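BUG-802 | component: ligand-complex export | severity: low

The export step for CBA jobs runs without errors, but we want the raw record kept on the ticket for reference. Input record follows.
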Amino acid sequence: SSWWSHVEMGPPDPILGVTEAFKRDTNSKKMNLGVGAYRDDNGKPYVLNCVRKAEAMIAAKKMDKEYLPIAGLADFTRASAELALGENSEAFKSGRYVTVQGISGTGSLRVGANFLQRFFKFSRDVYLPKPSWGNHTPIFRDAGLQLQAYRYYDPKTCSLDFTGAMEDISKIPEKSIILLHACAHNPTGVDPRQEQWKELASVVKKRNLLAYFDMAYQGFASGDINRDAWALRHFIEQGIDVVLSQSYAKNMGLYGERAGAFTVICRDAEEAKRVESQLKILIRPMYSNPPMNGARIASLILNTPELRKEWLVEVKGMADRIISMRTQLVSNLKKEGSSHNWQHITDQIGMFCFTGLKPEQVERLTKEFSIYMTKDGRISVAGVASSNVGYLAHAIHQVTK
Amino acid sequence: SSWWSHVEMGPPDPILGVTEAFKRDTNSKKMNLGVGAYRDDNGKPYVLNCVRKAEAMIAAKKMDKEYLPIAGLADFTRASAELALGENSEAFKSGRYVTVQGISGTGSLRVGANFLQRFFKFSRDVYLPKPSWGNHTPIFRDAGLQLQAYRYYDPKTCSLDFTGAMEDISKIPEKSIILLHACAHNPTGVDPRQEQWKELASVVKKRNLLAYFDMAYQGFASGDINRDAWALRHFIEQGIDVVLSQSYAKNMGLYGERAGAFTVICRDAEEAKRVESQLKILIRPMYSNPPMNGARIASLILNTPELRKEWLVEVKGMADRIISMRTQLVSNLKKEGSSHNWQHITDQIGMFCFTGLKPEQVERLTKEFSIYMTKDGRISVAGVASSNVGYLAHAIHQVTK
Ligand SMILES: Cc1ncc(COP(=O)(O)O)c(CN[C@](O)(C(=O)O)[C@@H](O)C(=O)O)c1O
Ligand SMILES: Cc1ncc(COP(=O)(O)O)c(CN[C@](O)(C(=O)O)[C@@H](O)C(=O)O)c1O
């Protein structure tokens, strides 16, 4: 009877755990459609061109590796605030915001959730859409808050339950927290229409809810960054002080370098100055200061005009390509002879497709074809290339036949 | 009355907060002697030679940036386990250990403290030496445990209170947690003598305490890595299953890239397999997966024979140099005419000197001379170069005169 004899075997991650099993498969045809990760049209990991050149300059600069302030590299801190908010922004231009570099999206989410646990004096309830990014629960639940839900997807239809959403939303108790995904809602890929968005804006403002925005896909929903941040900016200009979390994992393909940011819209510059002090104190007994390489790559790109341009050409290139694969997917399905309606594939936006497949169908895809996706039926179309679109399609067809 | 109006201004970090103030000073003679950071003999940030070459190979390799498993890069994971444990080790050779890449030392400490909060069923008490690394409190206290103390320094003497230590230690309740620093106890730079260490080993084993080892300075205490890990290995071979935290911030000068590791000595390989599962689950709702660059730099050096050799030559070079500055310090003091006994400067080991200066003396050093150190009288001698040894010495003398 040792210290840890009582410690039982936990299960593998629901998403992350899929790459671990994918890795062991010997099928030379295996496809890893589970994590949200981008592959080029040869189905190879794609390290963006502006990333490769930003590395070379850091390199060339011969930089030191000294600890960064607890809140992160300032330029990166400020360049994100601005990319999230728009440069003309009154919030941004008044300096009533505090952005802290975090350990990507996940890590900004958690510093935030931990900020709310500690200073969000009006409620312990965080309302997540139905469904949501499976990690959002444990994020919030280990942080110390309570989890709730509001209706969002309509599986009979393959779209938003806008009536059910505003019924749940207009009834959440005042001063509660509501998580809303900026764009490329995960795992559904169905976002409120701008129209829908003005209405949610109203109810949130009216019920006085703390709006927490998750923006892990900025530029993946429409292929335009500014367009993808509309919703967030529409909120803030309606006078809603939201908190937000950003990831550069996907739009800059910085996955394992981990660069991301957590921001709070405050009342004045002075309040901003005090929420910062307190966020630092929270982050010091955590990991002390943040990972420098991603932060430095991102900043040089966000802040060097030509790198900023090259990056948007490349973000667009990525969005288009997912599109081309959606398209090509539905068509081989028809071609294979599927009888099913696959229109949601092409209708959905972002890196995934919320397919509808059941678990037995997922399970045989894995086992007869070496096609790994999450058991909720989600596949990452981001990771399909010109050369296995045909394979997936036939597989999807066989197990669906 | 906004969401955050009640949020008050917190104070700046006790250590980290010193670099922030140092930064603003305009004195062309300012010295930053507060964080534990290495400067070369020109008093410039030193990016080690094996680091610079390990970067070039990664570069050259054209590597991807795909997410790393939740526990980190395997090679790095395994190379640290081994650097901490020795290759002949029965623990290591039996595979009864689980090492997880963490967000440096701070970040491994916290995943660990959070592991103990969740599975350490026998106590909520962590005993820290008197004094200890100021961040150890909030680390453990935000994690959810209780803080206690055992006597360690003897300020009348400028050494260990070994009698007072074993009295407190032999009286800690059974199954409690005791933090012990591997080598280069911070902030004192006074370590148990090997002899002392065999005795502590006994009491810990005898009272059945969970020993948690902090090893942020491996190779800084004696200039030899294996020698610096004696104590930890002596423990484990006495049959004490400790947990440990490692930082590559200082011995590899990876400060802001953040590479570090948290390890648990378990009973069998199978228990190891289950503590891992559970550590992952704990880390997924935290920052999800860890920062890749430091982990990749460290691994290539730990695992490539010539990089391993070059790194130990360089670790030694660093240890010697701190020594040369201790030496040179005491001597300009004599030379300036100090009457005081400065023998502890040269007696103490690691990156610092626990000087004895009081707070008024610290305060005028900052203000008349632009010499920043922590208010506990700690200075980082690591950061003195051949060219300002004379400056510091005269300053120390003036305010001490
Ligand atoms: C909606 C949402 N929010 C936050 C994140 C966090 O991402 P990161 O911490 O790397 O910056 C993801 C990534 N979701 C996944 O791509 C996915 O396959 O769902 C995957 O990255 C994951 O980490 O689960 C996400 O989809
Ligand atoms: C005793 C101890 N344990 C853990 C750490 C954590 O370090 P890291 O998270 O970077 O890997 C430090 C660093 N202590 C300091 O150098 C110091 O001046 O005390 C400084 O790095 C700090 O972070 O406070 C330390 O001295």
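Assignee comment: Attached the raw record above. Chain A touches chain B through 78 residues (CB under 8 Å).
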